[PDB]
Design a binder for this molecule. Structure first.
Ligand SMILES: *[C@@H]1O[C@H](CO)[C@@H](O[C@@H]2O[C@H](CO)[C@@H](O)[C@H](O)[C@H]2NC(C)=O)[C@H](O)[C@H]1NC(C)=O
Ligand SMILES: *[C@@H]1O[C@H](CO)[C@@H](O[C@@H]2O[C@H](CO)[C@@H](O)[C@H](O)[C@H]2NC(C)=O)[C@H](O)[C@H]1NC(C)=O
Ligand SMILES: *[C@@H]1O[C@H](CO)[C@@H](O[C@@H]2O[C@H](CO)[C@@H](O)[C@H](O)[C@H]2NC(C)=O)[C@H](O)[C@H]1NC(C)=O
Ligand SMILES: *[C@@H]1O[C@H](CO)[C@@H](O[C@@H]2O[C@H](CO)[C@@H](O)[C@H](O)[C@H]2NC(C)=O)[C@H](O)[C@H]1NC(C)=O
Ligand SMILES: *[C@@H]1O[C@H](CO)[C@@H](O[C@@H]2O[C@H](CO)[C@@H](O)[C@H](O)[C@H]2NC(C)=O)[C@H](O)[C@H]1NC(C)=O
Ligand SMILES: *[C@@H]1O[C@H](CO)[C@@H](O[C@@H]2O[C@H](CO)[C@@H](O)[C@H](O)[C@H]2NC(C)=O)[C@H](O)[C@H]1NC(C)=O
Ligand code: NAG
Ligand code: NAG
Ligand code: NAG
Ligand code: NAG
Ligand code: CL
Lengths: 321, 170, 321, 170
């Protein structure tokens, strides 16, 4: 999964977006708008809009617009430390439960991280970007508290305030941990030694592409465009690999095609979010003339309930009741 | 097309009844827009605890999940069908997963029961009411359509997909 | 003065540059290459190349390539706190003396800041970028220690390590303090309230232009181009003011022309610096069809020893002995 | 065009003599490329302490400054002429500036004398030797050309321009 928060050069707007990657068998999608009339002094938010799936009482992706004015994006890290993974036990709350309790109780990004950290399971080990839009004053400032980055591994959640980085222009996220203690303890340094710089935080292909291209975002259209970006035949950072880019098409891998990779993009800005609005597209990217994905080509994978072909457009998601 | 529905808490029977209309006096009301083949998305929208009855927080959450399970059960079952074999190919894995989710859910419920004073556990309780409701709702819809209802394990498994991804290779 | 350090998207190279702004009466320039055979266990560097002036045993600008592998850039902050300025006394070392002692004794950016801080005078209150090229491994990493930012006011020097920001793409510098304690104590918050966002760190015109355009640097030519940039008639961030941009031309101010503003650009990358090489242009910018500067138009300002007209090019500065 | 020159420390007289050639056995040697009208830059390059004589560090620094002052004095005087009125328009300001630089230089020299053990002050001493040399060199060049030599104050003022900018409005 790829995520990006990008602020315009005069703080004229701020964009945030997530493009999910997983098995195409997960593309039976439901976009959800919930509003529950909860009355509780320790509840900050009981209204939220988010990308989701049948039976999921969570986004999974994640992409959430919360009534507390927080936006939550997330991309998944791996943990390659087998000893660490031994600490996982069922006596703990699962990620989706901690995300839901935190997104209900918290009113700022530090409090979100503190609540989400409680009874950490060490399962679904992720980076969260908690973007507190209450701290954003367009044409003026990104105040302290605007961005917290939260990363979970078994036994340990680290979080820090990262607004000063975001004031330079952007925060990117591409499945590699940012906090050095996390990255070390999860075993990334040995993976870099064994498999090279695709495992490094600074020089993974998507780190290089976002470093190169985030400044090309000037508006909503160009935010859509970077988050749907593939270009694998020409982008030198892709090394010719259709998964080596922002919006992966592993079905196009020429020697081992598989039905998985990037299958959505959700994007909003601070104006859309204040009305619980976002633009959302479901399906692998066709940007730049890539072939429409067709289930007919992977017809032994179950995909009950879904269309055969994915060539949709972004539509406007907003609550209407 | 769009399916509207409304749930009503019947305080005495302690049960929800559902009707297939949009009624703003209802305890959870809203719709499922079955647009997945048209746009690549279904759209679900739920407004709960905004009706005539004044409801405890836990019953608002239960009613919202009930309504969602009632409207989306067919698709809950398709999504399970589609993702189950993506994660589970061997009964050995199913054993590991059943055992973990069973111990985890039991542990979650016991803490909720124990920590009735605590604001954090009280909100865990709200999430778990919504999950009971979702289970209650999907069953209601199944019985009414004459299908075998999904089990609570199947609903735990759907909500746990993210936690299962890194966990199963362990 | 404007300065910029910009790393390429795959850490393929790193560029650093400074464009001086001051009175055009200072454009009698000397580019200096010194190599002194000092033998002393506490000396790290006695060889250095830098932009300078007649009689200056320092750059002033500043732009230094030191044999310790450090590069020093600097831009001047203002101190608007009159009580603070009362603490200045002659019992202290002047800035040029501390810059020289530090650049001679220090082998890394923390040690540079510690040595430069001793006997601080509170005069020439500046931000320094100490770029330690020994920490730069192209196509691989910017290691800890690559960038230190040092800021001086009377009684207080603050410094911090800023490599993580620079790994996102760039470090800009434009006469406004970065460290919050510095910015507050120097009185910038009251200036912003009194005079608006040109005094803010995040939204001064050059902050916005570098935020917008640093990603347009792909090579040496485009690094030259951003550091010579004016475009004031069209750039919306200039508000029509020929000084409101990277390379100021206050002589072109239409109601109060003055002979001052940007009068040089020096630029190198890590390959040029390892041979004590840089490209350097002397004169106000003519980029984008701006008029050549002519002293004839300000003929009551003394400018003994200088040419009449400035239309030079960048030339290669390197030692040859 | 390019002017080459070479300085020689005469250890007994404790004086430098300069010659207008590039001689690599010299104690500081190098050139001044008077290209300011051609390119917008003069170019100065000095290699010091690389000759026959093995020299203490302080005398290497003195010789390098001596050589630079000897080659660039004419331009040192033009730069002073040009910048003096940019900073000083009232004798009141000149009073403030003279007083500060005099007290500051006296304080600097006294510390250098006192802290003869300290690595930091020893390097302050190297910078101050270079400055004495620059003063010694520019004078030599002036006398030899029959001009009034620049004063030490004028050289302090050139090196202090940055410190003076924020200081003078105080
Ligand atoms: C922030 O600044 C920009 C102007 O730079 C404002 O947006 C523009 O204002 C112009 C002229 O006033 C309008 O015609 C345009 O519609 C806007 N866009 C552009 C690209 O100029 C914007 O309103 C300001 N935002 C806030 C919150 O004050
Ligand atoms: C992988 O994680 C394991 C488990 O946390 C780490 O081993 C621990 O290291 C700490 C601190 O150094 C020691 O005090 C403990 O003895 C270890 N704990 C256990 C349970 O073994 C190990 O350091 C990590 N591996 C890598 C590469 O960082
Ligand atoms: C349910 O979803 C359908 C599917 O998109 C929506 O119908 C579209 O609405 C747009 C915008 O109003 C129209 O311009 C399109 O022509 C419709 N397209 C199709 C293919 O039907 C409908 O608006 C949604 N209704 C609710 C209640 O969510
Ligand atoms: C860093 O990576 C780049 C390649 O991305 C190297 O530079 C290029 O290498 C190509 C092909 O090998 C050469 O033909 C070009 O001259 C280089 N430039 C470009 C734009 O491709 C570079 O050598 C690497 N640097 C280091 C230190 O390893
Ligand atoms: C301007 O600087 C002055 C002088 O440093 C500041 O006043 C000092 O504040 C400290 C800490 O708050 C006090 O303990 C001292 O009493 C003050 N010192 C002196 C000598 O007066 C003042 O805080 C600064 N102004 C602004 C706007 O930050
Ligand atoms: C002194 O400076 C002059 C002025 O630039 C240099 O002469 C130029 O050198 C370039 C590159 O070698 C030639 O192509 C030019 O034609 C020369 N131009 C002019 C206008 O003279 C000279 O190289 C320098 N010498 C030293 C010792 O520094
Ligand atoms: C992470 O690993 C690096 C490189 O081995 C080590 O030097 C560094 O100090 C570690 N950092 C932390 C925070 O543990
Ligand atoms: C499944 O794919 C193969 C071609 O790979 C084809 O022969 C078979 O008929 C397909 N079935 C479909 C598209 O229903
Ligand atoms: C700087 O000033 C701000 C805004 O007034 C104040 O709230 C903040 O804490 C100050 N920061 C420091 C480091 O002194
Ligand atoms: C100085 O400028 C004025 C025009 O502003 C002109 O009349 C005078 O002759 C000038 N002297 C020069 C260019 O030497
Ligand atoms: Cl950046």
């Amino acid at each position: 999964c790829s995520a990006l928060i990008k602020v315009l050069p005069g703080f004229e707007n701020i964009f945030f977006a997530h493009s999910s990657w997983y098995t195409y068998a997960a593309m039976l999608r439901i976009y959800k708008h919930w509003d529950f009339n909860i009355v509780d002094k320790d509840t900050s938010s009981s209204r939220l809009s988010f990308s989701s799936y049948p039976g999921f009482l969570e986004s999974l992706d994640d992409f959430y617009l919360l009534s507390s004015g927080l936006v939550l994006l997330q991309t998944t890290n791996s943990v390659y430390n087998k000893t660490l993974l031994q600490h996982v036990v069922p006596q703990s709350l699962l990620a989706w439960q901690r995300v839901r309790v935190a997104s209900m109780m918290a009113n700022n990004g530090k409090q979100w991280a503190e609540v989400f950290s409680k009874y950490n399971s060490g399962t679904y080990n992720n980076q969260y970007m908690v973007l507190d839009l209450k701290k954003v004053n367009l044409n003026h400032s990104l105040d302290e508290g605007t961005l917290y980055i939260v990363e979970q591994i078994p036994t340990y959640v680290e979080y820090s305030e990262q607004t000063a980085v975001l004031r330079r222009g952007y925060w990117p996220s591409y499945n590699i941990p940012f906090h050095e203690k996390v990255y070390n303890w999860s075993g990334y340094p040995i993976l870099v030694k064994k498999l090279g710089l695709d495992y490094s935080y600074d020089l993974a292909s998507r780190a290089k592409i976002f470093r190169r291209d985030q400044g090309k975002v000037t508006d909503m259209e160009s935010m859509k465009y970077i988050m749907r970006y593939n270009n694998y035949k020409q982008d030198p950072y892709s090394k010719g690999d259709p998964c080596n880019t922002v919006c992966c098409r592993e079905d196009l891998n020429s020697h081992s095609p598989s039905p998985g990779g990037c299958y959505d993009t959700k994007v909003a800005d601070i104006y859309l979010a204040s009305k619980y609005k976002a633009y959302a597209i479901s399906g692998p990217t066709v940007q730049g003339g890539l072939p429409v994905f067709h289930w007919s080509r992977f017809n032994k994978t179950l995909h009950e309930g879904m269309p055969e072909a994915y060539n949709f457009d972004f539509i406007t998601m907003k609550p209407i009741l | 097309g769009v399916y509207y529905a409304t749930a009503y808490w019947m305080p005495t029977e302690k049960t929800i009844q559902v009707k297939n209309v949009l009624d703003r006096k209802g305890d959870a009301y809203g719709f499922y827009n079955n647009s997945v083949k048209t746009t690549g998305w279904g759209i679900l929208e739920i407004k709960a605890g905004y009706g005539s009855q004044s409801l405890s927080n836990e019953i608002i959450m239960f009613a919202a999940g009930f309504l969602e399970g009632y409207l989306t059960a067919p698709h809950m079952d398709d999504h399970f069908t589609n993702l189950y074999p993506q994660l589970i190919k061997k009964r050995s894995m199913l054993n590991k997963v059943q055992d973990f989710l069973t111990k985890q859910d039991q542990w979650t419920r016991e803490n909720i029961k124990y920590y009735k004073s605590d604001p954090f556990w009280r909100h865990a309780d709200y999430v778990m009411a919504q999950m009971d409701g979702l289970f209650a709702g999907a069953t209601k819809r199944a019985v009414l359509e004459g299908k075998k209802p999904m089990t609570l394990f199947q609903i735990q498994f759907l909500n746990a997909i993210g936690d299962l991804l890194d966990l199963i290779p362990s």
